[PDB]
């Protein structure tokens, strides 16, 4: 499972 970017969860 790849790690998400710092901002991947921001709208």
């Amino acid at each position: 499972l790849l790690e998400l970017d710092k901002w991947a969860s921001l709208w």
């Epitope: 790690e3 998400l4 970017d5 710092k6 901002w7 991947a8 921001l10």
Partner: antibody, heavy 132, light 108 residues
Framework: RITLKESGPPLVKPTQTLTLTCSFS??????????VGWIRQPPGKALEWLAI???????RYSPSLNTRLTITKDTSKNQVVLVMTRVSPVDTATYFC????????????????????????WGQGITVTISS | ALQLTQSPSSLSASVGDRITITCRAS??????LAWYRQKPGSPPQLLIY???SLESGVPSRFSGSGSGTEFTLTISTLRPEDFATYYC?????????FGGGTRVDVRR
Amino acid sequence: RITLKESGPPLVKPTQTLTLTCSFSGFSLSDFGVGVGWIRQPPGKALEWLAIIYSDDDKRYSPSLNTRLTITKDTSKNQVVLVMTRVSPVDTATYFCAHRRGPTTLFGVPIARGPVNAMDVWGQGITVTISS
Amino acid sequence: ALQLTQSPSSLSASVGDRITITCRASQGVTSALAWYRQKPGSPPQLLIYDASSLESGVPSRFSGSGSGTEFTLTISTLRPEDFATYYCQQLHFYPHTFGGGTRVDVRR
């Protein structure tokens, strides 16, 4: 407006440590969510992502080089340093530092991801050769 | 592990031409895709961020499209300074990844 410049040794011997410094102007690393990243380009080859550090001291490394890479910052000096240990000739490349924008904020709180999705200003690049 | 595949890896064209380059991601990267132009001896220069947003100061002939796994960069009217190598980069997953590049040269 934003400028970045890499400095370091042009020549390093195998097994030694390479230290590159990025000095910048036009932004501050205390700006919310800002990043400074490193990318390299081996002679005749494509761009390769190395590492990133953010204003909150969050750091990420290329998984295949994370044993040899260390990224650090000095916010009052407007400098970011990349340290690479145990170099070999495979590490001969042009090294670029680059700026990543933080999110669109209103009242200092983020309202939009957009702008972060690129490295928007790059330094000129520094050529480093590893050889004995 | 994320792969970005650029196509074609090479193309030729002529001033005034319209060209299209595509990037496919092995996994969805939402809109987190940037396009760059690099001339020999120079650093990459940002054209398009967030898949379709035109970077300030970039000529209007550049445009980007797509979301998820499939992305396109379009130059409506090739100019002399556009003969160069183009890269995509995804910023949705760590590590950030660049594509292999697409070299655009003068046709004869």
